[PDB]
Amino acid sequence: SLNWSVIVPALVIVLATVVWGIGFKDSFTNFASSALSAVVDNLGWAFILFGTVFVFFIVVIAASKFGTIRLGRIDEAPEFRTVSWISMMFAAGMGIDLMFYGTTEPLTFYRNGVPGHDEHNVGVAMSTTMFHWTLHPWAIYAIVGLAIAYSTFRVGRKQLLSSAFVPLIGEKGAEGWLGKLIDILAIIATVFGTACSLGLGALQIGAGLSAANIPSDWTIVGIVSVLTLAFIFSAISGIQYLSNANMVLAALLAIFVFVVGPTVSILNLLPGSIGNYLSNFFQMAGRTAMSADGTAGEWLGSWTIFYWAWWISWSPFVGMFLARISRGRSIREFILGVLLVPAGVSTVWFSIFGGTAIVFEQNGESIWGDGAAEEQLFGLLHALPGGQIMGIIAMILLGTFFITSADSASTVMGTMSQHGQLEANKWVTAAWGVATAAIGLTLLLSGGDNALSNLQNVTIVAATPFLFVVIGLMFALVKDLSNDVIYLEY
Amino acid sequence: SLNWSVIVPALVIVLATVVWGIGFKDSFTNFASSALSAVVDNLGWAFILFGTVFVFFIVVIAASKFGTIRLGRIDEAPEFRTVSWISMMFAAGMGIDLMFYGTTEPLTFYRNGVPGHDEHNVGVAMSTTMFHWTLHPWAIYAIVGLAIAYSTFRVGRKQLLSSAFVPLIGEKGAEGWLGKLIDILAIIATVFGTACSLGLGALQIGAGLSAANIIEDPSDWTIVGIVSVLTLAFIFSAISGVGKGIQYLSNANMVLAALLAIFVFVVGPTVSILNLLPGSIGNYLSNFFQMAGRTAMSADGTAGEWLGSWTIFYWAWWISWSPFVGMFLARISRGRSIREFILGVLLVPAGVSTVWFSIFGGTAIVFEQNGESIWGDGAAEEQLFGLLHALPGGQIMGIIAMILLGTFFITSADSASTVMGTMSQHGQLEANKWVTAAWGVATAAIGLTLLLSGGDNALSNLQNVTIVAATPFLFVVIGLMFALVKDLSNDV
Amino acid sequence: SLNWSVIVPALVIVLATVVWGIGFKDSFTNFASSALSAVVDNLGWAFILFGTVFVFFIVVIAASKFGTIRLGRIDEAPEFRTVSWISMMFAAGMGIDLMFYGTTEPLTFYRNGVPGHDEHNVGVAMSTTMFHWTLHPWAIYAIVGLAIAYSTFRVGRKQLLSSAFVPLIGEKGAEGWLGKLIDILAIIATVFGTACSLGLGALQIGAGLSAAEDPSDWTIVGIVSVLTLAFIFSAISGVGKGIQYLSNANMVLAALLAIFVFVVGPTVSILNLLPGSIGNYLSNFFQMAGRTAMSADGTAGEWLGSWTIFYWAWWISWSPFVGMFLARISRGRSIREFILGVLLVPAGVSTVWFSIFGGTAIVFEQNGESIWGDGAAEEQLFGLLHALPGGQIMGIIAMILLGTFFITSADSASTVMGTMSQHGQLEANKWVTAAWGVATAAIGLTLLLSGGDNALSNLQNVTIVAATPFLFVVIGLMFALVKDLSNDVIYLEYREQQRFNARLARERRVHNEHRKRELAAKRR
Ligand SMILES: OC[C@@H]1O[C@@H](OCCCCCC2CCCCC2)[C@@H](O)[C@@H](O)[C@@H]1O[C@@H]1O[C@H](CO)[C@@H](O)[C@@H](O)[C@H]1O
Ligand SMILES: OC[C@H]1O[C@@H](O[C@@H]2[C@H](O)[C@H](O)[C@@H](OCCCCCC3CCCCC3)O[C@@H]2CO)[C@H](O)[C@H](O)[C@H]1O
Ligand SMILES: [Cl-]
């Protein structure tokens, strides 16, 4: 039974964008690049303040008595081995996002410097990206992951975000407004969040193509068309297979750069980027548009605030995944797992790519070149022996990522587009994929030169509504837990 | 029971110094500016070290099992309500200075910079101000007020500074060599503290009168015209019982303070004041230790004088109010829990202050940034109003800022003038009106007395003297830190 | 009993290194300098990373439930009682360098500045030295001293060091390709280190004996002979515990010239440096823990090579003797009580030591009276106290100090190396221990010839290069210390009770939601 009460109000907005954006582009590119400014100016304090509130909240919940509570029936144990569990989180924190920013993120920070500091600064270059890909995001994925796991396993509600809000709102199934609105926002967010990955991943393919068979905007459509097409072919079975073919390619690329690049230096950056990240954490936690001397405003809009929005928009999906994979875990074991494990991949993957990118800058090999993030990865690879064949596998890996990232995404979307049915309808899954690949393709076309700007801009806008929901999820979750049987028994 | 035995040495010493101030003169203006510089040069290390140990100690103790143990028989609903339990604490410890320094403190640090930092650093500016007004001070308040509220409302010992040390002292020798000298220092430092913070506070009101009185602050006419309205503003708030006086007075003060802050928040630079919430907190945590460890040995041995004007002076300043502030914080929490009490005198005056400073100092800095500075000549008393007048409805709001200056002083005087009578009556919670009104009119006398040297000066002088006289107290809070653990331990 | 499959191949390599130094040099000198220049370069990242991990590990372990697990059978009271307990730990712990470094290292960082900072940074100066001399080096010790203490006393195996790896590789089958090689490295690393510390220790005594004029040579060979004779005796006067006299005497003396430079020198400038040092330390903690050769801007390669990475790789080489020696003394003390007697206390005295000595050295530097004498660490100690009322008179006890401060690291060391030669026993046994002592001195003054200073300076470099695998040992010792610790009866009994309570409570719960759910069907 497809809950149309949600499917359509979320299809109105998804279509409206792929309507007043693709053809009627002027009003789109304009409205977007000003609406993004509206929220970053008056709501940046929100993304920032609550962004670190999540990391605290979630840590104190782990350390709380709630930690011993078991996501499932009383004294229930896990469905999988711990190491099997961990390896599903290692692969959980991997994909387009790390491909695209792995090289340019720390690079840009080193080359252009950071508000509150100066250029050519490794420590700050590294600890800043650590900031963007470690504790902060996964706290959000933990908040949403936990809320879902708890409501669907421990209390046996529907696997919908709306359900996690029962303690506060419900008010029955919280139906009508709110319950529907929460899940409606959950859908929208998931779409644009993944549309932001499918998008820039598609324009990292294009840039990669300029390293073999060889800017024509048409190609981007050509790219998306084939990938979104393979998405439909492989949505009839699969994800479990390619998500395993991803970890070989990715490991091949990383292990490659690690050996064939400045091995010792990359290694140096492990303790470095972790030691810096802990030293600067709160300084970074304290950067708003008021620093540095009312100057760090613009930067924050293009990094810290963007990411924050993107992480929050991707929490309905990633939250589902973790919950769906952590049944039987204690709340404490869950939190610590979701925080510490995924961040291991980030830390390493950035030290591998962004690490050698920094070393090339210092040694005059600079792979910057016109400063187009999209074509920086291949810039890196090419500077390494055998990096001409690696630059291709890098594309084939982005290709496979695109698909799987859209399989898993749409599954979760179908799941919440019909009363939280785990049994995903193979049609309502595909219907959400090509719909996501639409706005992914829309943000690319509507911008051209900028592209990446609007691709980051609108997601910042599609996410801001859902920020307040995650914020409320903190309240909906302390109530559930303090009303738990075990906690009332202790 | 008019204790007695200790009032003699007090009254005569508070009298001897006030004669040294109006009589000999100069030789007393010599002491203040040299004695203070003496303690700050030598005991400086002991203020900033045990200053950060005071903070980690109450945190550890509140997070410990002892946090759960109530401060009563076991079942005893708190005498006063919640939002007033708080109001009373904040509005009793905090003086008038929060009114001005909320603007000056941040603005100054921004303009000039602080040791080991370049100027115009917004983060460092908010951080250092918080470091001075948030966690640290309210720790050297909690530690005293807790030791007391426990020594009495849980053990039973008379509400006296000597009883809290019983677990260390001869357990009854708290009425001899030390016991006496402690209750004496506690009243001498409580009389002086209230003395100058009264008359000298009346001067702040003088300059504050810039949109109303408009000079020349009729030399002494309006200064005495303020000391009168002020002295005859409390003394009744105290003797009329906390019920309508202290309690209701402190709740009004908070509502107006709240009201004023909300004004400059909405009409002022909102999204900026809003950004300085994470900015201030984040920078605070980020800078906490490097400033917890800023000593006169940095930078390269230069911050000594800056510390002498700020950090250290404050630690001595607050240590100088603990006697009568911790005494009032205990009496307002009959059946409060140690854990809640602590995170009720720490984790809320800190919140309040952080919001306060971010709103006022944040605005002062947003103006300074857009070239529309409100520094003007650099006087504290006028910066606040200069800040207000710059906003629509500023002149109007100026008058309720004036009301706030009075209330912010009086709520501290009336509340602290009750404790003057209690520690002069063997430690009676309830005190005779004729004694708590005598100690309020015997300080207004010495405060109004030092208005003979033209004005100010001697008031600021004896202030500094009170600090060097209340310096022994730093060692009290260290030891009180010991006679609270080796007392909470011998519980049940 | 004696282990002639460990003690034998130990001597065959401690002698092949002799020939390397004396009968060759160059190939010795150059290699000894080209080797650590590779472990610093290639394994530096790991020294740095795990050095900080160590600190956290035994800190959580301490505050953990494993915390109150007595070191030895449940009852059992301390064998020495405190005071002298931590007193001798600091004795086997910090050599003669705490003297000629506790004063010159704060000054050198202040005067030359530290990577990522300007010079004359009093904060960073006190900050960085603590980083090298407090929490990070004593973690390396407590971990080793814990694995071993728990292993021998609580469980009940040999004092031998590979008795801590039975948890990972066999109840005793950990004997062959590994285990005995761990013992063989330990016995080697101890012989070398106790030898160099004797040669370079000696070369210093004289270079510092110019306090209260003649150079060195020969009249310095007589100095090593009063030490190599005083640390071997020891042996008796215990029995085997003459260490108490000396070790527990480094308080009255060291506290004496400490309280001297404290009251005579700039008392307030030191006092101020107490919060200044702690505060700054905590503040720069993770910054320093993050500092590698890729920061700053790819520049701090050499400074770390000369300072931090060399320090870490140095404490890891020393870890065996201290870890082993820290095993006893601690018998009958909580995992917690032991972790705080190896961390907080030594870290607390080192702070005050650096504040007073290294502190005034920074103060004189500020007022113009620089103590920096051509950059010689030897004189700088004496050159400083010479500038104080009682300069020569204290320079004497400072000289008696650097003398006793050495033999405490040799008398205990010998005790240990002798223990790891006789199947890990705890009794004196005069010789063997004394046999390891004289044989230690052999290289001390044999290396000294044909090579000059480079002899002991390159040997003590090689000692490290052949002790770097120990890094990995202290890494794995974490996995053993916890895999072992978690099989403790008191603990197994603890969690087993928790498991039962989880089941039982669930039983009560699940039988109530039945009663009241049908009891609530009675209210149809
Ligand atoms: O998930 C296990 C939990 O572990 C403890 O805390 C959380 C585990 C911390 C380690 C997390 C790491 C694992 C993943 C990778 C990095 C992080 C307790 O809260 C405990 O109550 C909890 O469960 C414990 O394990 C027993 C095994 O069934 C339980 O029966 C329960 O009694 C408890 O002892
Ligand atoms: O650009 C580097 C390439 O040239 C050589 O470099 C060596 C090697 O990388 C050599 O491995 C390196 O030092 C070794 C690092 C030791 C750390 C050991 C870890 C390595 C892999 C993870 C587990 C253990 O130093 C050199 C400089 O990088 C290598 O031989 C490789 O061909 C390749 O790494
Ligand atoms: Cl449970």
Ligand code: NA
């Ligand atoms: Na007040």
Ligand code: NA
């Ligand atoms: Na020693």
